[PDB]
Design a binder for these strands. Sequence first.
RNA 1: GAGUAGUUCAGUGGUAGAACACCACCUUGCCAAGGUGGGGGUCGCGGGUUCGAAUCCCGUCUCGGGCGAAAGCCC
RNA 2: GGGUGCGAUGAGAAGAAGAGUAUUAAGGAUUUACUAUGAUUAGCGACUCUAGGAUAGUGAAAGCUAGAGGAUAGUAACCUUAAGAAGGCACUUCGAGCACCC
Length: 81
Amino acid sequence: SYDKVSQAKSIIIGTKQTVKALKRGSVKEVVVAKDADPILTSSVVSLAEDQGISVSMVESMKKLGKACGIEVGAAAVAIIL
RNA sequence: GAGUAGUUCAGUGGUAGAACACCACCUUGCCAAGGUGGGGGUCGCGGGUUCGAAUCCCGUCUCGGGCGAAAGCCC
RNA sequence: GGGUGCGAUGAGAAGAAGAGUAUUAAGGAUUUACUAUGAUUAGCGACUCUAGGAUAGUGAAAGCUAGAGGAUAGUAACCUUAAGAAGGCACUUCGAGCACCC
Ligand SMILES: [Mg+2]
Ligand SMILES: [Mg+2]
Ligand SMILES: [Mg+2]
Ligand SMILES: [Sr+2]
Ligand SMILES: [Sr+2]
Ligand SMILES: [Sr+2]
Ligand SMILES: [Sr+2]
Ligand SMILES: [Sr+2]
Ligand SMILES: [Sr+2]
Ligand SMILES: [Sr+2]
Ligand SMILES: [Sr+2]
Ligand SMILES: [Sr+2]
Ligand SMILES: [Sr+2]
Ligand SMILES: [Sr+2]
Ligand SMILES: [Sr+2]
Ligand SMILES: [Sr+2]
Ligand SMILES: [Sr+2]
Ligand SMILES: [Sr+2]
Ligand SMILES: [Sr+2]
Ligand SMILES: [Sr+2]
Ligand SMILES: [Sr+2]
Ligand SMILES: [Sr+2]
Ligand SMILES: [Sr+2]
Ligand SMILES: [Sr+2]
Ligand SMILES: [Sr+2]
Ligand SMILES: [Sr+2]
Ligand SMILES: [Sr+2]
Ligand SMILES: [Sr+2]
Ligand SMILES: [Sr+2]
Ligand SMILES: [Sr+2]
Ligand SMILES: [Sr+2]
Ligand SMILES: [Sr+2]
Ligand SMILES: [Sr+2]
Ligand SMILES: [Sr+2]
Ligand SMILES: [Sr+2]
Ligand SMILES: [Sr+2]
Ligand SMILES: [Sr+2]
Ligand SMILES: [Sr+2]
Ligand SMILES: [Sr+2]
Ligand SMILES: [Sr+2]
Ligand SMILES: [Sr+2]
Ligand SMILES: [Sr+2]
Ligand SMILES: [Sr+2]
Ligand SMILES: [Sr+2]
Ligand SMILES: [Sr+2]
Ligand SMILES: [Sr+2]
Ligand SMILES: [Sr+2]
Ligand SMILES: [Sr+2]
């Protein structure tokens, strides 16, 4: 949901920073794009599903980053609430 | 008048010079820079002169310009 | 504010490598290569020898090719001391702008 990402209080942008955020489990929701490379997505959805956190899948990664406030797009973004 | 190494240029009768570019070592994380080494050239082509032609001479191919009715001639 | 290019498939910054390396100085050492140079007189032109080539003139000996052998430095290669860097990719944290133009 692009709506939940555009809103929310505490978010984090980028795959590396989202997995690093998963390494402390201070994240409430995880939003990942489908059109992104699976080599980069599987790595985060594995740990996300392992932690027991909810895993969402969205269409485009461009509109994702657009919803995050960034101006280039993001492969994976986590709401750290 | 221009034609010379991959490129940009020199070479005003003595077997072809430099810069940049290429290769090799330095140099195993990968490039760049650098510092040392080497390789490469029917001098557009063919004759002529000469011991020796990139250089002078004749012919000829390509390019730019000029003169001319044209053929041709000149730079 | 504007025009491009690039950026979470990581802008940018710092750290870490790079490295006590390249290298500049002060020495030690006297072999390998590269480069420069070879009395006077002829001569445009000479380190010496050899083998081909080729030779008009000048010369004791000529310009090409292929080898081999000599000293003087100037060099890079090897040691010691004191100094001694560096750009980008990859690495590690931080994560949103940076470069060119008016
Ligand atoms: Mg120290
Ligand atoms: Mg020390
Ligand atoms: Mg010395
Ligand atoms: Sr002429
Ligand atoms: Sr001519
Ligand atoms: Sr040529
Ligand atoms: Sr000329
Ligand atoms: Sr020569
Ligand atoms: Sr070579
Ligand atoms: Sr090494
Ligand atoms: Sr180099
Ligand atoms: Sr060189
Ligand atoms: Sr060569
Ligand atoms: Sr050479
Ligand atoms: Sr030649
Ligand atoms: Sr000609
Ligand atoms: Sr000829
Ligand atoms: Sr002829
Ligand atoms: Sr002849
Ligand atoms: Sr001619
Ligand atoms: Sr004529
Ligand atoms: Sr003729
Ligand atoms: Sr013409
Ligand atoms: Sr004409
Ligand atoms: Sr005319
Ligand atoms: Sr002439
Ligand atoms: Sr602007
Ligand atoms: Sr812009
Ligand atoms: Sr574009
Ligand atoms: Sr950076
Ligand atoms: Sr840095
Ligand atoms: Sr440092
Ligand atoms: Sr010194
Ligand atoms: Sr000495
Ligand atoms: Sr020795
Ligand atoms: Sr003399
Ligand atoms: Sr002399
Ligand atoms: Sr000489
Ligand atoms: Sr000789
Ligand atoms: Sr010598
Ligand atoms: Sr002989
Ligand atoms: Sr003779
Ligand atoms: Sr004689
Ligand atoms: Sr020789
Ligand atoms: Sr020496
Ligand atoms: Sr040293
Ligand atoms: Sr921007
Ligand atoms: Sr203006």
